[PDB]
A = this chain, B = another copy of it.
Amino acid sequence: FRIGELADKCGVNKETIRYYERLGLIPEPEEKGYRMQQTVDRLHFIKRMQELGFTLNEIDKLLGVVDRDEAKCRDMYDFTILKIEDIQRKIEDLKRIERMLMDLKERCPENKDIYECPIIETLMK
């Protein structure tokens, strides 16, 4: 149904890497070529998974599994849980950085109009 300049209606710029990577299907040759609906859907799915924090690699694996299995709902459920747990790990890492920044900033004296900043000194060593 669509031509790829169209179908970039999924909010993706004209993307050969996706089918180059097997994620997206190959288009079919119409009046010669060249057109891509279930691909529209697969591309929505992929775009949103990426907005949900799945890497392209993860999406590659996931799609292989769901495509080849009988219980697709179960697969997808499982991967979504693994994703929740991944996001939680990222969150914790950011919290660890926040805490570091906090300790750094708490190093500063009452009078901060000085050349010597314990933050800079600390990060310099």
Contacts and interface: CB of A to CB of B under 8 A. Distances in A.
Interface of A: 41-42, 44-45, 48-49, 51-53, 66, 70-77, 80-81, 83-84, 87-88, 90-91, 94-95, 97-98, 100-102, 104-105, 108-109, 112-120, 123-125
Identical chains in the assembly: 2
23 contacts: A42-B124, A45-B120, A51-B97, A52-B100, A53-B97, A71-B112, A71-B113, A72-B114, A72-B117, A73-B108, A73-B109, A73-B115, A74-B112, A74-B113, A75-B117, A76-B117, A76-B120, A80-B101, A80-B105, A84-B98, A87-B94, A91-B91, A91-B98
Contacts of A125: 44
